[PDB]
Design a protein around this motif. Structure first.
Motif, PDB file in Angstrom:
ATOM      1  N   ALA A 249       0.851  -1.125  -0.146  1.00 28.71           N
ATOM      2  CA  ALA A 249      -0.083  -0.087  -0.042  1.00 28.71           C
ATOM      3  C   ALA A 249       1.045   1.259  -0.110  1.00 28.71           C
ATOM      4  N   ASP A 250       0.591   2.246  -0.846  1.00 30.40           N
ATOM      5  CA  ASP A 250       1.239   3.552  -1.102  1.00 30.40           C
ATOM      6  C   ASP A 250       0.207   4.590  -1.053  1.00 30.40           C
ATOM      7  N   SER A 251       0.450   5.642  -0.207  1.00 31.71           N
ATOM      8  CA  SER A 251      -0.368   6.874   0.025  1.00 31.71           C
ATOM      9  C   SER A 251       0.234   8.192  -0.043  1.00 31.71           C
ATOM     10  N   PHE A 252      -0.075   8.887  -0.774  1.00 36.80           N
ATOM     11  CA  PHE A 252       0.226  10.426  -0.679  1.00 36.80           C
ATOM     12  C   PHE A 252      -0.750  11.319  -1.246  1.00 36.80           C
ATOM     13  N   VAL A 253      -0.630  12.326  -1.486  1.00 35.42           N
ATOM     14  CA  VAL A 253      -1.173  13.672  -1.808  1.00 35.42           C
ATOM     15  C   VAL A 253      -1.026  13.961  -3.302  1.00 35.42           C
ATOM     16  N   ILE A 254      -1.921  14.006  -3.959  1.00 35.96           N
ATOM     17  CA  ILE A 254      -1.809  14.456  -5.612  1.00 35.96           C
ATOM     18  C   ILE A 254      -2.962  15.518  -5.746  1.00 35.96           C
ATOM     19  N   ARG A 255      -2.320  16.614  -6.720  1.00 35.35           N
ATOM     20  CA  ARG A 255      -3.086  17.583  -7.267  1.00 35.35           C
ATOM     21  C   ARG A 255      -3.933  16.896  -8.217  1.00 35.35           C
ATOM     22  N   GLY A 256      -5.025  17.671  -8.163  1.00 35.82           N
ATOM     23  CA  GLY A 256      -6.219  17.476  -8.883  1.00 35.82           C
ATOM     24  C   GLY A 256      -6.167  17.354 -10.538  1.00 35.82           C
ATOM     25  N   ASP A 257      -5.032  18.215 -10.731  1.00 33.10           N
ATOM     26  CA  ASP A 257      -4.826  18.562 -12.400  1.00 33.10           C
ATOM     27  C   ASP A 257      -4.387  17.423 -12.999  1.00 33.10           C
ATOM     28  N   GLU A 258      -3.714  16.343 -12.340  1.00 35.97           N
ATOM     29  CA  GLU A 258      -2.795  15.262 -12.833  1.00 35.97           C
ATOM     30  C   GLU A 258      -3.363  13.975 -11.830  1.00 35.97           C
ATOM     31  N   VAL A 259      -4.391  13.679 -11.307  1.00 33.27           N
ATOM     32  CA  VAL A 259      -4.846  12.702 -10.849  1.00 33.27           C
ATOM     33  C   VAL A 259      -4.807  11.472 -11.662  1.00 33.27           C
ATOM     34  N   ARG A 260      -4.957  11.538 -13.070  1.00 31.48           N
ATOM     35  CA  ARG A 260      -5.000  10.601 -13.904  1.00 31.48           C
ATOM     36  C   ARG A 260      -3.718  10.226 -14.253  1.00 31.48           C
ATOM     37  N   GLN A 261      -2.476  10.886 -13.723  1.00 33.44           N
ATOM     38  CA  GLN A 261      -1.260  10.215 -14.148  1.00 33.44           C
ATOM     39  C   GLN A 261      -0.805   9.039 -13.536  1.00 33.44           C
ATOM     40  N   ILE A 262      -1.597   8.604 -12.627  1.00 32.64           N
ATOM     41  CA  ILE A 262      -1.578   7.287 -11.866  1.00 32.64           C
ATOM     42  C   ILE A 262      -2.001   6.323 -12.627  1.00 32.64           C
ATOM     43  N   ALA A 263      -1.259   5.511 -13.605  1.00 35.09           N
ATOM     44  CA  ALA A 263      -1.773   4.685 -14.475  1.00 35.09           C
ATOM     45  C   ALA A 263      -0.649   3.837 -15.085  1.00 35.09           C
ATOM     46  N   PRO A 264      -0.688   2.577 -15.272  1.00 36.63           N
ATOM     47  CA  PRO A 264       0.461   1.969 -16.058  1.00 36.63           C
ATOM     48  C   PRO A 264       0.429   2.467 -17.301  1.00 36.63           C
ATOM     49  N   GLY A 265       1.715   2.581 -18.003  1.00 38.34           N
ATOM     50  CA  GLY A 265       1.901   3.076 -19.409  1.00 38.34           C
ATOM     51  C   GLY A 265       1.641   4.427 -19.713  1.00 38.34           C
ATOM     52  N   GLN A 266       1.750   5.398 -18.526  1.00 37.42           N
ATOM     53  CA  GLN A 266       1.021   6.616 -18.630  1.00 37.42           C
ATOM     54  C   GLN A 266       2.414   7.698 -18.136  1.00 37.42           C
ATOM     55  N   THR A 267       2.046   8.915 -18.867  1.00 41.07           N
ATOM     56  CA  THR A 267       3.187   9.870 -19.042  1.00 41.07           C
ATOM     57  C   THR A 267       2.601  10.949 -18.454  1.00 41.07           C
ATOM     58  N   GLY A 268       3.455  12.132 -18.045  1.00 44.31           N
ATOM     59  CA  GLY A 268       2.981  13.150 -17.475  1.00 44.31           C
ATOM     60  C   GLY A 268       3.937  14.024 -16.620  1.00 44.31           C
ATOM     61  N   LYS A 269       3.563  14.908 -16.012  1.00 46.24           N
ATOM     62  CA  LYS A 269       4.554  15.675 -15.016  1.00 46.24           C
ATOM     63  C   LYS A 269       5.439  15.165 -14.144  1.00 46.24           C
ATOM     64  N   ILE A 270       4.627  14.382 -13.252  1.00 47.47           N
ATOM     65  CA  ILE A 270       4.948  13.544 -12.130  1.00 47.47           C
ATOM     66  C   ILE A 270       4.955  11.924 -12.150  1.00 47.47           C
ATOM     67  N   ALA A 271       4.405  11.649 -13.281  1.00 47.82           N
ATOM     68  CA  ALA A 271       4.545  10.185 -13.567  1.00 47.82           C
ATOM     69  C   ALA A 271       5.654   9.943 -14.075  1.00 47.82           C
ATOM     70  N   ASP A 272       6.480  10.534 -14.653  1.00 50.54           N
ATOM     71  CA  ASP A 272       7.896  10.083 -14.887  1.00 50.54           C
ATOM     72  C   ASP A 272       8.846  10.639 -13.944  1.00 50.54           C
ATOM     73  N   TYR A 273       8.365  11.571 -12.896  1.00 54.58           N
ATOM     74  CA  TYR A 273       9.383  12.126 -12.093  1.00 54.58           C
ATOM     75  C   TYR A 273       9.178  11.991 -10.615  1.00 54.58           C
ATOM     76  N   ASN A 274       7.977  11.416 -10.091  1.00 54.76           N
ATOM     77  CA  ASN A 274       7.609  11.294  -8.582  1.00 54.76           C
ATOM     78  C   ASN A 274       7.172   9.888  -8.281  1.00 54.76           C
ATOM     79  N   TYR A 275       6.460   9.222  -9.272  1.00 58.43           N
ATOM     80  CA  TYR A 275       5.848   7.904  -9.278  1.00 58.43           C
ATOM     81  C   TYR A 275       5.380   7.326 -10.440  1.00 58.43           C
ATOM     82  N   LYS A 276       6.387   6.186 -10.699  1.00 49.80           N
ATOM     83  CA  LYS A 276       6.115   5.392 -12.134  1.00 49.80           C
ATOM     84  C   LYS A 276       5.656   4.152 -11.721  1.00 49.80           C
ATOM     85  N   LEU A 277       4.659   3.713 -12.531  1.00 45.40           N
ATOM     86  CA  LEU A 277       4.072   2.391 -12.600  1.00 45.40           C
ATOM     87  C   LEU A 277       4.385   1.715 -13.635  1.00 45.40           C
ATOM     88  N   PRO A 278       4.783   0.259 -13.370  1.00 45.93           N
ATOM     89  CA  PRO A 278       5.106  -0.664 -14.482  1.00 45.93           C
ATOM     90  C   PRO A 278       3.996  -0.909 -15.338  1.00 45.93           C
TER      91      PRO A 278
END
Lengths: 49, 49
Positions: free
Chosen positions: A7-36
């Protein structure tokens, strides 16, 4: 039945809530949390304004 | 047709579909060629006998 659960928990800005997904790119997806790409699991998000 | 351009000019997670289509087409063409060669070889064997 599963083997282990992580289980991993944190606080994400609403503008990039959909960055959290496999095979996804964005401002923080490649910089803060990457999913396989083959990630198996669930993501849960609820408002805490 | 160039898979290198597919890899470079397009994102990793979605290029899998294009790579898979190319793989299927090329593999099926190879299979067809091999089958025709088998039939031709059988005919040539009859002639040699």
């Amino acid at each position: 039945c599963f083997t282990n659960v992580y289980a991993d928990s944190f606080v994400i800005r609403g503008d990039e809530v959909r960055q959290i997904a496999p095979g996804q790119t964005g401002k923080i997806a490649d910089y803060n949390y990457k999913l396989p790409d083959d990630f198996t699991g669930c993501v849960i998000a609820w408002n805490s304004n | 047709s160039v898979l290198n351009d597919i890899l470079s000019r397009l994102d990793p997670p979605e290029a899998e579909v294009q790579i898979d289509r190319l793989i299927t087409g090329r593999l099926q063409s190879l299979q067809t060629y091999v089958t025709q060669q088998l039939i031709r070889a059988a005919e040539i064997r009859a002639s040699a006998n």
